[PDB]
């Protein structure tokens, strides 16, 4: 699901160049901070699963969900919201 | 690569004491789309084997 323009449908159905930049950049940030956490003797984040997610979501080589919007995403509700990973990590990169 | 290995001086003396063949494998490919086109598909794998 993408708020990215592909004018006149010129391109692949799954052109996610900017979605991929966002995924690459987030994992790049997660990885630099994981090195910082090791140097500081903090607990390290799970880079392993966020690294498979980049693999899975890039061109959707595995059945995942990629939501990208160049101008921001809002997930709002009056009721409860759940972001849950059953077996792996949730990563909030910023 | 099998003919290369029979030529290879590294295994010059090891190969004559066993069987150097090319194993071939072929399994069925479920491609429902190509089935509608009348195209049935197989995956053939081949490597040099040494017993």
């Amino acid at each position: 699901i993408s708020a990215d323009m592909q004018p006149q449908a010129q391109g692949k159905m799954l052109d996610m160049d900017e979605a991929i930049r966002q995924l690459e950049q987030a994992l790049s940030l997660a990885r630099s901070m994981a090195k910082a956490a090791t140097a500081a003797n903090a607990t390290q984040g799970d880079i392993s699963c966020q690294q498979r997610l980049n693999a899975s979501l890039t061109d959707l080589t595995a059945p995942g969900m990629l939501l990208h919007a160049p101008d921001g995403i809002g997930m709002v509700s009056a009721r409860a919201l759940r972001i849950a990973s059953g077996s792996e990590s949730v990563g909030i990169m910023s | 690569v099998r003919k290369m290995l029979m030529t290879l001086p590294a295994l010059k003396h090891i190969l004559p004491h066993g069987k150097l063949t090319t194993k071939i494998r072929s399994i069925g490919v479920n491609n429902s789309n190509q089935r509608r086109a009348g195209v049935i598909q197989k995956q053939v794998g081949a490597a040099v084997f040494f017993e």
Binding site: I1, A3, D4, D71 | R36
Partner: protein, 71 residues
């Protein structure tokens, strides 16, 4: 009766069920599982209800791309 079908030999179909209270539209192609858009009173091959509302359905990828925003 109550079903207008535009069905092509490749089973690309635009089916419109007119059974009142059970109307639906099925836009289905055979490719990728069954890539369908089902609107309305969605039924299976046995004409049993399998869902109400809209279903964009495939065994391949879904891509929803709106250049000005997704709501």
């Amino acid at each position: 009766g109550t079903r207008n079908v535009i069905r092509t030999p490749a089973n690309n179909k635009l089916r419109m069920e007119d059974k009142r209270g059970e109307e639906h539209i099925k836009l289905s192609t055979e490719y990728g599982g069954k890539t369908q858009l089902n609107l309305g009173h969605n039924v299976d091959a046995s004409r049993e209800l399998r869902g109400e509302g809209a279903e964009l359905r495939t065994d391949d990828w879904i891509s929803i791309r709106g250049g000005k925003g997704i709501f």
